[PDB]
Write an enzyme that holds these catalytic residues in place. Structure first.
Site, short mmCIF file in Angstrom:
data_model
loop_
_atom_site.label_atom_id
_atom_site.label_comp_id
_atom_site.label_asym_id
_atom_site.label_seq_id
_atom_site.Cartn_x
_atom_site.Cartn_y
_atom_site.Cartn_z
N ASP A 137 0.81 -1.24 0.00
CA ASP A 137 0.00 0.00 0.00
C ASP A 137 0.86 1.30 0.00
OD1 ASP A 137 -2.31 1.67 -0.01
OD2 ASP A 137 -2.68 1.35 2.10
N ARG A 141 -0.03 9.08 0.33
CA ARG A 141 -0.83 9.24 1.59
C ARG A 141 -0.21 8.39 2.72
NH1 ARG A 141 -3.61 4.20 0.23
NH2 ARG A 141 -3.76 4.73 -2.03
N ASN A 142 0.64 7.43 2.37
CA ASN A 142 1.25 6.59 3.35
C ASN A 142 2.73 6.90 3.62
OD1 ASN A 142 -1.22 5.44 3.82
ND2 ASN A 142 -0.84 3.68 2.41
N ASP A 200 1.88 2.97 7.48
CA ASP A 200 0.65 2.20 7.17
C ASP A 200 0.96 0.80 6.67
OD1 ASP A 200 -2.36 1.93 5.89
OD2 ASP A 200 -2.18 3.62 7.41
C1 LIG Z 1 -1.64 22.25 7.14
C2 LIG Z 1 -1.91 20.83 6.59
N1 LIG Z 1 -2.90 20.11 7.44
C3 LIG Z 1 -2.48 20.09 8.87
C4 LIG Z 1 -1.41 19.00 9.16
N2 LIG Z 1 -1.94 17.66 8.80
C5 LIG Z 1 -2.84 17.10 9.86
C6 LIG Z 1 -2.11 15.86 10.36
C7 LIG Z 1 -0.99 15.99 11.20
C8 LIG Z 1 -0.30 14.85 11.61
C9 LIG Z 1 -0.73 13.59 11.19
C10 LIG Z 1 -0.04 12.43 11.57
C11 LIG Z 1 -0.46 11.18 11.40
C12 LIG Z 1 0.48 10.36 11.87
C13 LIG Z 1 0.60 8.97 11.95
N3 LIG Z 1 -0.39 8.18 11.51
C14 LIG Z 1 -0.11 6.78 11.18
C15 LIG Z 1 -1.12 6.20 10.18
C16 LIG Z 1 -0.08 5.99 12.49
C17 LIG Z 1 0.39 4.67 12.50
C18 LIG Z 1 0.41 3.98 13.72
C19 LIG Z 1 -0.01 4.61 14.91
C20 LIG Z 1 -0.47 5.94 14.91
C21 LIG Z 1 -0.50 6.62 13.69
N4 LIG Z 1 1.73 8.44 12.49
C22 LIG Z 1 2.71 9.22 12.93
N5 LIG Z 1 2.61 10.55 12.86
C23 LIG Z 1 1.52 11.15 12.34
N6 LIG Z 1 1.18 12.41 12.13
C24 LIG Z 1 -1.83 13.47 10.34
C25 LIG Z 1 -2.52 14.60 9.92
C26 LIG Z 1 -2.51 17.56 7.40
C27 LIG Z 1 -3.31 18.78 6.87
#
Ligand SMILES: CCN1CCN(Cc2ccc(-c3cc4c(N[C@H](C)c5ccccc5)ncnc4[nH]3)cc2)CC1
Length: 305
Positions: free
Chosen positions: A141, A145-146, A159
């Site tokens: 995947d 986006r990942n 992911d």
């Molecule tokens: C100005 C642009 N705007 C604000 C910032 N982002 C919002 C955002 C900020 C941080 C995250 C984020 C998701 C994330 C994340 N998610 C993954 C799928 C995850 C995997 C295992 C456990 C927890 C999370 N993991 C680690 N750090 C992360 N940071 C997602 C969306 C996007 C749109």
């Protein structure tokens, strides 16, 4: 073949303080938050995943497969699991990637992203993926986006919801049904559900194409059932405006029919590196987070055990 001696860390709910939703939807919720281990005296910006609030034996078995894959990876360009929390609802705890996902970030910053960065991200994703190949692991995947953004200069693959470790020198993973993202799949995946490091390479191709078009949707319009035929005819995604033929020829290669004709991630590293040394030769582009007593904050990349 080799024994997986990764440690799975179980974390007390008392150890970490949530601090706001970051994303809701299908899966469940992701929270910004802080993690203060034992007594250590260090605070760790974390993301915390919770596959919906619903505790259906279905859901719980999946989030634990991620935990399994994520706990076994260790590389600067792959996101690592810090631990799980065994509340009623099983939480995944991971390093906070404060800038969010790479897809959203190119979108939100077209007029400021230069060739140096585009090529550097390409290299960094190739590294992540090459490392995954080393640990004989097939992501299934990979998509813009990942990939998450720790800083604009530093990205990491995430992911692992579909990632499959390849057992007894099995050279191709034969998959089930379930929802799968068509527009990023190799042809052997859409037709025969074969998935291989080389079908990961295809998705790389498309990921790179997302970055270069600043976040366009591949085959925008064309609906999913059409895809496998479009690709069979010989059609691929168009050359992005900013792309020299050198860079696009790399995409195209990642999209070949004979899977072993596509490049290896280790080659993709090499080629994008060369290119990263003279970025303006290869991309033509016009123009070329802290909120409460931050004294003991340490990024996860500096917290080892
Ligand atoms: C100005 C642009 N705007 C604000 C910032 N982002 C919002 C955002 C900020 C941080 C995250 C984020 C998701 C994330 C994340 N998610 C993954 C799928 C995850 C995997 C295992 C456990 C927890 C999370 N993991 C680690 N750090 C992360 N940071 C997602 C969306 C996007 C749109």
């Amino acid at each position: 073949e080799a024994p997986n001696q990764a440690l799975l860390r179980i974390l007390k709910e008392t150890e970490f303080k949530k601090i706001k939703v970051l994303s809701s939807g299908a899966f469940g919720t992701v929270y910004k938050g802080l993690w203060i281990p034992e007594g250590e005296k260090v605070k760790i910006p974390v993301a915390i995943k919770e596959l919906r609030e619903a505790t259906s034996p279905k859901a719980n078995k999946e989030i634990l497969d991620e935990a399994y894959v994520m706990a076994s990876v260790d590389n600067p360009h792959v996101c690592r699991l810090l631990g799980i929390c065994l509340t009623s609802t099983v939480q995944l705890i991971t390093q906070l990637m404060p800038f969010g996902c790479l897809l959203d970030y190119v979108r939100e910053h077209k007029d400021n992203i230069g060739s140096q960065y585009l090529l550097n991200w390409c290299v960094q994703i190739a590294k992540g993926m090459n490392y995954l190949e080393d640990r004989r692991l097939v992501h299934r995947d990979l998509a813009a986006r990942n990939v998450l953004v720790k800083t604009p200069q530093h990205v990491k693959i995430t992911d692992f919801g579909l990632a499959k470790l390849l057992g007894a020198e099995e050279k191709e993973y034969h998959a089930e049904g379930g929802k799968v993202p068509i527009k990023w799949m190799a042809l052997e995946s859409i037709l025969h559900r074969i998935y291989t490091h080389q079908s990961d390479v295809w998705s790389y191709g498309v990921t790179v194409w997302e970055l270069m078009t600043f976040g366009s949707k591949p085959y925008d319009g064309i609906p999913a059932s059409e895809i496998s035929s479009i690709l069979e005819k010989g059609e691929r995604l168009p050359q992005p405006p900013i792309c020299t033929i050198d860079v696009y020829m790399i995409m195209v290669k990642c999209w070949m029919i004979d899977a072993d004709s596509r490049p290896k991630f280790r080659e993709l590293i090499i080629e994008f590196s060369k290119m990263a040394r003279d970025p303006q030769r290869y991309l033509v582009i016009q123009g070329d987070m802290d909120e409460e007593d931050m004294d003991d904050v340490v990024d996860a990349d500096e917290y080892l055990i």
